[PDB]
Symmetry: D3
Subunit: 242 residues, 6 copies
């Protein structure tokens, strides 16, 4: 209880959530997910105009932390995936404007957290992969579809393949590519856009714009991770060469 896997910088127009496990590729431990949920909930209570998501170290996030998954039960793993989806839905449906800034190699729920944010930028060298369908996981699927279209989503998710910054830009997954040196200016621009409307009107606008399939998404996640043999499917995937 003395670590800080999530750093939160609070300013009047913006809170910045820095995933802070840089020796573990910002992988989502149960502790980090719970910290994110708490932070996001607090920001919604305080009607923070802009939430910024970033990662310390070499990347944004490698997604689910598979360290010691062998010593966790099938139930333990299901709970952690459910809490991840609950987090993603809170970020996706936020009354705050949300901004994500990705760099390095990003994976799974890490990419989904990025996807849940409305303004999305990455470094020209950044990379993304959502490989979970290889072990039967159905996470972030419809949200990714809503962004890039069903054709591109099938192409990418169906073969559980990587895609780079250029491809991410082409398919509309990122607004633009931007070096880390340009990130402070992007945050300022996002802060200005977020505060252009009052909290109640901003929340209403977000609610009106969003395609809400939260229940379908959570059901699909729950079913996928609750199929008997989840742990074995993970084991098989992690033993695979690429």
């Amino acid at each position: 209880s003395a670590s800080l896997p999530l750093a939160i910088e609070r300013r009047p127009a913006a809170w910045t959530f820095t995933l802070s496990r840089p020796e573990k590729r910002n992988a989502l431990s149960a502790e980090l997910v719970e910290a994110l949920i708490d932070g996001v909930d607090a920001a919604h209570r305080e009607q923070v105009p802009l939430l910024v998501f970033a990662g310390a170290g070499r990347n944004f996030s490698a997604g689910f932390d598979f360290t010691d998954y062998e010593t966790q039960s099938e139930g333990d793993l299901l709970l952690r995936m459910v809490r991840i989806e609950m987090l993603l839905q809170r970020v996706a449906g936020s009354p705050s404007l949300t901004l994500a800034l990705a760099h390095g190699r990003n994976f799974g729920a890490g990419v989904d957290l990025f996807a849940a944010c409305k303004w999305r930028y990455c470094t020209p060298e950044a990379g993304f992969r959502m490989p979970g369908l290889k072990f039967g996981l159905v996470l972030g699927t419809r949200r990714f579809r809503d962004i890039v279209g069903a054709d591109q989503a099938l192409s990418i998710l169906g073969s559980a393949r990587a895609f780079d910054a250029d491809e991410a830009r082409r398919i509309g997954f990122v607004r633009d590519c931007a070096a880390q040196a340009q990130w402070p200016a992007l945050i300022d621009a996002a802060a200005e856009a977020a505060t252009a409307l009052d909290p109640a009107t901003r929340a209403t606008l977000h609610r009106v714009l969003r395609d809400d399939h939260d229940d379908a998404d959570l059901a699909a996640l729950a079913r996928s991770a609750a199929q008997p043999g989840f742990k074995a499917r993970i084991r098989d995937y992690l033993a695979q060469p690429a």
Copy 2:
């Protein structure tokens, strides 16, 4: 040590008998998996009629809380998800489904009963879905669809018991029937189930059903995944 489930296979019907007499037919993970396996097998074979009953003194006491203190929050979530996956399989069955209740029934046990299309109980039977007392949202909309939003709020809102007479009044059971009359009900049900060709029976059930499976599973998952689940169970089990 006997198996927690007995399955009997006839041409027109399979009977699933819950058999945990020291545990009030409570749903262990093993029993739920046995039921899922059994119902899945029945569906592959297109068995016209599935019958659900309990050996001993009741239909079912729902989730088995034995040693819940030694299971993780995630273990308990998974078992609850698996129960809902079972309920949805039974509720959406292409087979005709019949449930026969007696004694005192609770929680997921009552929900399993509710998931069946033909529902009968002894005149002395009782039911309670107390799960909302520990924040659990299980079977809520399916119960609403049976009894109406008004009766559902009356019963679930206070998480209270109801007896066979109220169950009949509100449409929760078609009628009451003593255990001695059950083999005859099963025969009437098997005749009903084979009155239409299997594809037509399947179509009829699909056409009639109000499908909110995703909303149901999402609400279940959210409810059981809130931090402090075990502690809420603990507090309920004390009162």
Copy 3:
């Protein structure tokens, strides 16, 4: 001799099925006459549409006379047009009243079901046996009236039900002898004209559970499955 008689008064049009030597069975001609008549009434914004049958009954439904000489496609088309008729009546901005007597079958019962005010003679009978030959017609609209439990029992066994059972389950408002019928029509004409045409249309729209597309799709699928004529043949042989 035309198969349909239409009486036009200012507040009400009365559609009298006029094939009393053929049990008022729905030939393609009768169904088109009905569609044309109902469409005309809708253009005129007639407050009340009344449906009745000359002779011994309301209607025996689909006319199976010479079905063997009609193609699988001809039969599908006739069923589709029946459903399009039923949807026009069910969704009418007019108030609708149906008056049944004698023995009534299938699409005949569905036409009756599509009307908002439903009355029959104490001796009237109803049967919807279409599921016996795989036909899915009027299923959801019947469910909306009597509830999924009662619809499953009646449709899933294709049983005939009487006026007493019809009243019990809410399928008719009440039983009334043919002598009480003109007063019922008068009462309906008054209720129909109690609101202005635009507001009446709005109320009907706001109150209705619309699943017209799901119903037409299910009908079309059910009747277009290869071997339709053969399923009808096996049915028409039964007990």
Copy 4:
């Protein structure tokens, strides 16, 4: 003199409509007072909201006093605020209880209908006449309570109904003399507090048929039609 009294106890807030010389008619001020009070209760997560009327009745609905000095826009705005209040009550996380007596009209009946537990005195009456002047207010909520059949009967002829009919059609839980009202409030307070605040909220959300947007849209279209004030004038005119 204020048009609304609010009594706050630990488990309940009681909103007493307090315009007994004006039949508790809903002025713009009373509607806003009700909205502010209901919003405050929602922020406080009060288990139970009780609605009652001082004097001879529960409420006579929209206050048509000096409507001639109101523009059509003024009337639209007031109707919109009424619907917003009705939707806040109907969708409340609190248990809601309404206790009616005397003769009640329009939006008054709709406020009553928005509450989950509804009781009236043996001599209480109800009438929703707004469709006579083209108003579409509370229509679907009333339908959801009594069924499309009874809703059409009552709303389609914009007719009165007494306590006996209200009980028969499920519009009230029971008829109860005012002497029995303190015990009913106590029972409602017990029922409301049987679940924790978050769970009670989730239950209410899960059980409710939410068509708030269709309801507000229908209301707005009805009251924004050119000539709406003139239709009111015609309906209210004294000869």
Copy 5:
């Protein structure tokens, strides 16, 4: 009255609705909105294949007319906004093909009227802004999103900002940037497309293609404009 705030040219294939308050930037008074509703209803009854919308003078439309809003009640303002949304829904759901031709600087409900038309063109120098969210108004939101996508809708609506003709073309809001010299040829093409199908089939196609969220749109509009303090929010915005 004797003014003609809306001119309607009628031809067998097409009716052209010219907004004709060029000294008031074609702003939508209650009278102009009612004229438009009457005209669009008449066209529906008469099964006109193509409806063309254009503005006289320097622009298409400046949206809601705020002249003497101070002397109108909060209710009067809600009513006028409700009528505008009802108009927009009638245009958006029209069995006719609809064509809008914009120029100059356009605002609010004027941009929404433009958006309600299926084929849309503007001059290279045209500008658009939907600023109403600055005073809490929720008008045309879902319809704009359906055209340009949630991402671009948020980029524009989230800061209630202007966008020019180049941006409009990029985001798919207009078919092309076309000078008024091109407009006769474009109307000709639209009239040809409109009459390619019979009236019943054209109506069916339009219904099948449209994402109908009319009730949610009207509810969101009504709630936004009925919030106590509406007139004051308008006052604040106009002062900026």
Copy 6:
């Protein structure tokens, strides 16, 4: 004719290839061909074939509904054939298999809709497409087309009941890319690999989750349009147009 083979089926472990084989009739969909396609697609679904490939022998993919003996057929016969076509299209569009279509030549109506029902869609640079059925009141494939190309482009094409070429098809996202026939074996191999990247159950779930299901609305719209009295006369008038 029982000795004829209007549909050739090639069966391999990862892929079945359905080759429409009426090259003297522009691969037009007779009742027999539609029934053969339904039978074949149903069999593949039972056998959980990872990939279905659709192709046409001769000069094209398919000219849609075979009008050859329409005068000798009743209104009911024509309705039934159209309904069975929509049932086929819905089976293909909702397939748990990955689906690939390879178009060449001039294609029409239900032929273009069969192509549209497939997830991976490629055509030669010379391929042409037209869905003219709205000219005779037919409402077939309308919503699925809209879902692929967007309401704007769908209105531009269907509102005029007009042809569109391969360039336009690529531009609007109707085809993944233009590819000449020499590149087709490699595309099929790539498709088979993509199809087998996930296990059968997960593949089926991904497709289910990605798809916008409006099957009932689609079949209702089709049935209404083709059941309107005077259908055959509308067809006659359209076929007389020069």
